[PDB]
Every structure is written in C-alpha cells, then in structure tokens.
Design an enzyme around this catalytic site. Structure first.
Site: not given
Ligand SMILES: [Mg+2]
Ligand SMILES: [Mg+2]
Ligand SMILES: [Mg+2]
Ligand SMILES: [Mg+2]
Ligand SMILES: [Mg+2]
Ligand SMILES: [Mg+2]
Ligand SMILES: [Mg+2]
Ligand SMILES: [Mg+2]
Ligand SMILES: [Mg+2]
Ligand SMILES: [Mg+2]
Ligand SMILES: [Mg+2]
Ligand SMILES: [Zn+2]
Lengths: 60, 206, 155, 118, 25, 92
Positions: F91-92
């Site tokens: 997600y990052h």
RNA sequence: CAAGGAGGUAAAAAUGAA
RNA sequence: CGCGGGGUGGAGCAGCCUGGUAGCUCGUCGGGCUCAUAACCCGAAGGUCGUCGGUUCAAAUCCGGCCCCCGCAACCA
RNA sequence: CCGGGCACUCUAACGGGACUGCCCGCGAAAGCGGGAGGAAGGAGGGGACGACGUCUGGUCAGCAUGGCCCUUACGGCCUGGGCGACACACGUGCUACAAUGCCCACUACAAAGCGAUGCCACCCGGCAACGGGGAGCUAAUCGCAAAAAGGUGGGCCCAGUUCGGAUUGGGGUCUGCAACCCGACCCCAUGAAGCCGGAAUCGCUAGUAAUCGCGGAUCAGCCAUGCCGCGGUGAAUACG
C-alpha cells in the site's frame, strides 16, 4: 538449501572443479576472500572488532 | 544515521588489537578460524564471569589467551575446578600450548562490554528499559567517567512498534581520534524478538 | 555564485620565441593532451610560412590573431524569459581566446590534407583578412551590429 | 588484370589489389607474391605481363576462391539442412550462431529493429 | 583498431599475444 | 478469466495450488479473491465491500486494486472479461 | 548627508496517487 | 416507391468533373520532458476508396446494376 | 661485474617545517588585501572521519532473530536442462566512423602491486595460441613486463578505402571428468553497420578534463569492455 549446502562446501570430493570457496563465519558463497576464508561482510565486522591481526583502516 | 565502529576507527593509535599474531598466507586462514573458535567456545561457558575481552597472542605453537573479567569468581583456587580441564579442553582441536590467563577488570562500570551486557540482562528480566538506561549511564558516570552513552533500539517493552531509547551524560566525542572510547554491544533475547544495546564509555587522552 | 573572481591562468613561454601567446595557440591545437604533436604542427607550419612568403611567422601569426579579434559581440540577457540580445564589448581576455579558437577550428575546416598546411594557410589568409576565421569574426560583429536598438540596456 | 573472377584494382599496390578477391584477404596476399616472387609495392597497372601470368596461375589454382568457395561455404551451411543440429536452426531462424546474447543486440543477423510496442 | 585481433594494438588491448604481436625478440 | 501473472507466488497458488509464495494465513483469502477475479465477466462484479476496489492513478493508470488484508493489494488490468498482470504489492 | 508618504509589479505553465 | 446529393485509414474531412500523384486535422504506436499525469517536443506506422459488373494499356476518378445514408417532391378533385 | 665506499638516489622509523608569526594599508575587534620570507603557505593538495534526525528507505537470499507455515515432505542426494531464451524498450559502457590518422620495423622513459599445492628467465618445436625442456626465486636477490601514448624510419593518399571491425565458413590450441546448448585465445578466409549522431541528456575548475598503458582482488578456466588501484603526456575557461 543452506545447511546441507555448507556441508558440500567442506565435503569437497568428486571432480576437483566442483569444489568451491565459502565463508566460514557465515555460509556466504560470494565475495569470499581466499586470504581470510571469509565473505566481505564478515571480514568487515571482525576488522572493526579488532579481531583481525594487523588489519587496519586504509587512508591515503 | 550511519557511523563507523569507534573501535575500528582507532585500532592503530588508541585502542590496540585483540588478537596479536603474525603469519603469512597458507597459515593466516587456519589460525584465524581456530582463533575465532576459541573466542566462540570461551564466550559460552564463561559468560557468567562476564568477560570484557579475550586477548590472544601466538608464537609458533604458543597460543596465549588472556581473559579479562570483572569478577573472576569462576576460577576458584587451583584444583578447585573451573580452570583445570576448562583451560585444557581448548586443546581438543588445538593441541598447542593452551596458556590461559585471567585478568581482573577493576571497575565493571567503566567497561563498555560489561555495561551493555548488564543492560541486556535487564531487558530480558522485563525491566523498564528507559529507567534502566538512565541508571546504567549514571552508574558509569558515578564511577569517575568523563562521558557515557547507552543506546537500546527496537521493540522496546515488546509492543508492536520498534523504538530507540537514548541517554547520554557528560562528553562523548566520537569524531576525535585521541578519544579512548570503549564500545560494547549486546543481544537481548526476548520472547518477542531481539534488540541491540550499544554502550559508549569515554575518558581523556592527549 | 563566484565569490572569487577566478584569477587569470598564466602559461609557460615556448621555445625559440618567448610569446605569451603562441603556447596558448599550441594548446588549442593540442588534442588528448599531446603537446608534442601540437607544438610540432605549429612549428611545422611556421616553416611553411617561410616558403609561400618571406615573412617571419612571429608577425604572420601575430597579425592574424589581431585580424580575427571581435571588437563587440552579442549577449543574450534579461526580461521576457531572456528575450533580448544586448551587443556587448569584448574583454581583451575574451578577444584573445576567441581569436585562437576560431583560428584552429577554421584551420581544421579547410579541405587541405596535412594539419600543418591548414594552420599555415589559415594564418596567412587571416593575416591578410581573408581567412574563414575572419569570416567568423566579421559575422559575430554583424550580429552585434544589428542589435544596436536595445544596446542601451547595456550593463 | 582479370586475375581470378575479378580485374578491378588498377594503380594500387599488388599486395593490396590482391585483397579485392573473396579468398585472398591479407595473409594469402603477401604469401602469394613471395611464393611467386614478385615485388609487393608494384603499380598493379598492367606491369610485366609475365609476373601477372605467374601470379594468376598460382593464385587462381592452389586454393579455392571467389564464386567457387562461396558455393562451398553456402554448402557447408546447407550441411545443417537435412535433419541437422542446433547450429543449423540458428541459421534457419536467422539468429546468431555462436550462442550469444539475443535479448538485446544481435542486429547484424536479426537486421534493423521492428518495434512491437505493448 | 583496438578490437581487431590482427594488430599489435588490438593484441595489446585484448592482452594476449600471437603472430601479429610476438612475445618480444 | 485470469490470463497473465506478474507475481510468481500468486501464479503458483492459482495454477498448481502452491501456497509457499503467499503468507500462510492469507491463503484462503487470496484464493477467494483470485477466483472472483477469474469468474468476473466485468469489473463491476469485483465490487463487494470487502474488496475496497478502485482504479489506480498516475503511471499506474489502467490498473485496479482489491484489498487482501492490511496494507496488501492485488493489482491487475481488467479488460474484456479478463484480468492481466496479477501482482501482489504494497500500500506504500 | 539621513527618507517619509507617493506608482508602475510576475510569466504561458493545469492537475494528484489510492 | 419520383427527382437530387453522398459512402475514401480508428474519427471527421479533402482528392473525382481536366483517368496514371490518395492528402489534412485528430487519434493510435515509439522516444523524450516531469516525482508522476496532462499539455508540449521528436519519430513513426496505418486506407479491399460501399459492393457486382463494364470501358480502358491503366479506374477512388469514366459508365451501368443492385446495397444503405441524407435532402427535396408527393399537387387539382 | 669485482675491489672498496655508502657521500648522492632510494628504502622506512622517529623528527624538524608557518602558527598570515614578520612588513605596508584597512579595522573597534575578528579579519581582509598587498609584500620581501622560504619547497611550501591566510584550512598547501588529496584521504580517513557523516550531528539531532528524515525517508513505515534498503536488506528475513551474508548473518542473527519474534510470529506464521512445511515435514515420507516447501527437506536430502543425483544426471540433465535453465539463469546465456528474443518481435521488441530503457540504463551503464566498449570499439569506431579516420591523415593532430592507420599499418610495419626499430628504439626509449613509469609507478603501484602479485607470485615457490606458483611467477616461470633462457633454449627447442611451432606462422602463432601453445607444447617440450629447464635455471633462478620462501622473493628491495629470481620471475611476472617489453609499459603504452612518445621518438626515428618507411609504406598507404582520402576512396567505406591498409578507416572500421561486426557476422559467418574452415583449421587449431589450453583449462577442465566434460566446454552442444554456454569458455578464453590462436591462425586462414569473409569482411557488415557506421562518413560523427533527432527531441533531449552527462561529466569535469590543476595533474584537474581528455588521452595512454600497467597491477590487483575473485579466479581450474573465463564470457572483465566491469569494479578497486597505479603512474605516463597533459588542455580550455570562469565576465558574471
Ligand atoms: Mg482532472
Ligand atoms: Mg507516445
Ligand atoms: Mg506526459
Ligand atoms: Mg392549385
Ligand atoms: Mg572533523
Ligand atoms: Mg517498506
Ligand atoms: Mg533468515
Ligand atoms: Mg543473470
Ligand atoms: Mg552505409
Ligand atoms: Mg570519409
Ligand atoms: Mg570544485
Ligand atoms: Zn560470511
């Protein structure tokens, strides 16, 4: 394949070219210096420790 | 961050070696492995002594080994065991002159390895780390130190979130060469992981 | 931000001449740091000057540089996304540098076969006021000529 | 002089003029005129007709060259026609014979780029 | 011709010796 | 129908059932998602609340992203009833 | 010599990530 | 079903009348610029000319038959 | 090379040597500019040294280690294949398009390092790679090495050309149990693209950029044109 692989590295039979270097402190097969019998990683560790006789920082 | 090992940074001037022997090739490799296996075997059944150093010297089958300890309580008078076969078990893969000496580190509060090791014990005792750091520093500073600094990093007090506890009194100049700065490190094994303790002890020089 | 005004580099005088200029020219000839081949070519061409004309190359080379000197050049400056081109005067240092640079470049532009004969001829042409470098010099002064409008922006 | 299948090279040194034949190159060149006993630095411009005859007679014989050995070379590649090896398939696909890198490069056998895009 | 195997210059660059670059004398 | 993989672990779980490329506790999770992306005849079917579906922005435009667990996302390109370039990313 | 109040002000350059 | 106009790259448009050259803008594809997208810059590829026939050395173009599209006309009881 | 000597050179161990201390000027000081002073200067030129912290940065495949999982197996052995695949796209590079250049011959001038389970002088066979011998060397002793660019001589004469070396046929050698996939060289023959690069884009301020060769690590060998070092010749320009 890591434990049975540091076995072969010392076992060394069957054809002379199948034998290879291997760090002793670790189990590293790459960047293994013949002089110390160590990988570049371990060698740096111990050199900072002082456990490497004569081995000293290089500045020039 | 990124900082060089304050021991290796000296080595030459200030802080001498820890394994002082000379050899050319075809020998260095074998004798270094043996040398390291001595350090490895000693550290195990001698931790209760808390060893600050393991100096080693050689001169063709001579192998001298000096074990520095705060309290050499585990030596117990000649034939009172804790030395006999203990300094003789080295020569089960060596067979050379296993000359094992024992030194008395006077003040353990001025020996960086011992400081960090005392702290790392306390982490595993489930002590409050921040308070443990503070005390150990003052304890070092109480025993005449010119400067001290202890660092524990990661997973403090369990709890999912790697932290880094920091405390340092007096003067600790790492950049200076004439420093006489003792550096120690210790692994604290916990049921929730592994964290590292750095300990810096500083005295004058010139 | 140029706190130091960068002091002018000084050279070693050559052999036989003592020039404080010729060596600067030999340097421009020099490629890959071979001053041997560079100096040789110039002195070679100096021998070539003696043939086609009974003049001492120390003046032929000197006057050639003097004829390939830009009095004023065009400079792109301020306001409007650097839209203007103020015609500026040229410092004696820069006239110096441009003269020798344009000479060597125009010299290697020539259709001749040997480097020496290119240098010699381009110098003889430039001494007269005919060289391809003189073209370059006169061209740069045309540009500076056509921009006298906003020349008063100066600086 | 119409030495082998060619005649072209005029005023340009016989040791060099010889090179202009598929089969001569540079080594066989001086080897041929030292064995025939002719000055290498000559004009090539139709000099002593005798030297030219001897040269022609030796060169055109001895070893195979020009269109004949082109046929043999092409036939040696035709060897790996039939039900040939791996090296033949590399001559088939048009790819490099000696097992090199084909992920990039290899343009000398593949030819100019075609660009697929996706 | 630093990459041509038929020159003293290419033989230098390659390192190896041979006919186009003999091992001295 | 799933037609191409970019993640090797994902590839092995769906093809051979080889689970050693993904987390062990996310085996069932990743499976039900992949089957959904396989059965999906249009992107509108991959719209259950527990997937948190959305198309990516910037250089990743043309891609989609359903949520496995935590900061972990299965990204792909859906086109004409098929997904391509099935990846297992962060997600990052 | 030491400035108060007065007035002409940038360019063409838009968006946001899961 | 009666007259007139029209079917050309993925989209919109030329070229037809004065048979031998298919061109324009956008879009697609590659490469740049940027942290990234857009804009911008560079460089590419892409058309059975609706279909079946005919004339001609040669047909997008000239001539017939169908096939759709659009526009007019369909008035006096 | 000997006798002998070690003052020169060099070798490597401790020292001296500038601290703008001294002169002129500016200034309240700090300091700045300038000048003889010397090899040197106003941190002499390069290294080693990276603050509190930032990037939920990087690394569970160097290693360590919490948790999850696998155990007639997600472990273990073997032969073989694969990492070297190729319609393509990007990065870093090497070799070039030539005449301040290329080939051949002769002839000089280095530094930093590596070697007796190796470096291998000198002979012998061989066009050559290399093979047969075989001396010295635990190595400022012997060997790797002749440095190359340079210089002198001679030849090409501007032409895809004695530029360029790709690709391909054939013939060999060496390591290795073995080199088809996939090794490095040697020799013969082929000799491609490239005649200097669109939009864009990089490096470097003094021994520096450029250019030239030399060593080492790994290593049986080698796909090294890489990486880490060594010295050779040696620019240009900085208004702002
Ligand atoms: Mg928008
Ligand atoms: Mg595009
Ligand atoms: Mg864009
Ligand atoms: Mg009516
Ligand atoms: Mg400092
Ligand atoms: Mg992360
Ligand atoms: Mg692990
Ligand atoms: Mg690979
Ligand atoms: Mg061409
Ligand atoms: Mg040309
Ligand atoms: Mg600088
Ligand atoms: Zn290791």
């Amino acid at each position: 394949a890591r434990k049975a692989l540091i076995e072969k590295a010392k076992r060394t039979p069957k054809f002379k070219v199948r034998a290879y270097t291997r760090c002793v402190r670790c189990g590293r097969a790459r960047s293994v210096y013949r002089f110390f019998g160590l990988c570049r990683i371990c060698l740096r560790e111990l050199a900072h420790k002082g456990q490497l006789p004569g081995v000293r920082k290089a500045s020039w | 961050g990124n900082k060089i090992h304050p021991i290796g940074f000296r080595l030459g001037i200030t802080r001498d070696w820890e394994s002082r022997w000379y050899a050319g090739k075809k020998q260095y490799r074998h004798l270094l492995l043996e040398d390291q296996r001595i350090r490895g075997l000693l550290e195990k059944e001698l931790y209760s002594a808390g060893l600050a150093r393991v100096d080693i010297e050689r001169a063709a089958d001579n192998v001298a080994v000096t074990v520095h300890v705060a309290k050499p309580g585990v030596v117990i008078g000649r034939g009172g065991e804790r030395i006999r076969v203990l300094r003789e078990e080295l020569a089960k893969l060596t067979g050379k002159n296993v000359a094992l000496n024992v030194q008395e580190v006077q003040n353990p509060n001025l020996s960086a390895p011992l400081v960090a090791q005392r702290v790392a014990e306390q982490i595993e005792r489930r002590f409050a780390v921040r308070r443990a750091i503070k005390q150990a520093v003052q304890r070092v500073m109480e025993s005449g130190a010119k400067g001290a600094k202890v660092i524990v990093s990661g997973r403090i007090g369990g709890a999912e979130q790697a932290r880094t506890e920091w405390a340092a009194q007096g003067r600790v100049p790492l950049h200076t060469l004439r420093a006489n700065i003792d550096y120690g490190f210790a692994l604290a094994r916990t049921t929730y992981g592994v964290l590292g303790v750095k300990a810096y002890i500083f005295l004058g020089e010139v | 931000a140029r706190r130091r005004r960068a002091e002018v580099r000084q050279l070693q005088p050559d052999l036989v001449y003592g020039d404080v200029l010729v060596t600067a020219f030999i340097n421009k000839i020099m490629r890959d740091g071979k001053k041997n081949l560079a100096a040789r070519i110039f002195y070679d061409a100096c021998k070539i000057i003696q043939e086609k004309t009974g003049q001492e190359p120390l003046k032929v080379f000197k006057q050639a540089v003097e004829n390939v000197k830009p009095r004023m050049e065009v400079r792109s400056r301020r306001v409007g996304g650097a839209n203007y081109q103020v015609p500026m005067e040229v410092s004696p240092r820069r006239q110096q540098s441009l003269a020798l640079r344009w000479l060597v470049q125009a010299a290697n532009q020539r259709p001749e076969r040997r480097a020496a004969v290119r240098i010699a001829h381009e110098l003889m042409d430039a001494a007269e006021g005919k060289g391809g470098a003189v073209k370059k010099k006169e061209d740069v002064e045309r540009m500076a000529e056509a921009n006298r409008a906003y020349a008063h922006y100066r600086w | 002089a119409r030495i082998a299948g060619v005649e072209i090279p005029r005023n340009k040194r016989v040791d060099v003029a010889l090179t202009y034949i598929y089969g001569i190159g540079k080594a066989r060149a001086k080897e041929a005129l030292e064995k025939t006993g002719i000055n290498p630095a000559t004009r090539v411009k139709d000099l002593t007709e005798a030297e030219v005859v001897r040269l022609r007679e030796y060169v055109e014989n001895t070893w195979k060259l020009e269109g004949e050995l082109r046929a043999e070379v092409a036939a040696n590649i035709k060897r790996l026609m039939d039900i040939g090896c791996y090296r033949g398939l590399r001559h088939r696909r048009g790819l490099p014979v000696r097992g090199q890198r084909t992920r990039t490069n290899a343009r000398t056998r593949k030819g100019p780029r075609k660009t697929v895009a996706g | 011709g630093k990459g041509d195997r038929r020159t003293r210059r290419g033989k230098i660059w390659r390192g190896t010796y041979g006919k186009y670059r003999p091992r001295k004398k | 129908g799933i037609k191409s993989f970019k993640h090797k672990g994902l590839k092995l779980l769906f093809e051979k059932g080889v689970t050693s490329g993904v987390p062990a506790q996310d085996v069932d999770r990743i499976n039900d998602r992949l089957q959904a992306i396989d059965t999906a005849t249009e992107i509108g079917e991959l719209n259950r609340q527990i997937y948190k579906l959305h198309p990516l922005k910037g250089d990743r435009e043309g891609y989609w992203s359903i949520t496995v667990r935590a900061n972990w996302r299965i990204t792909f390109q859906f086109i004409n009833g098929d997904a391509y370039i099935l990846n297992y990313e962060d997600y990052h």
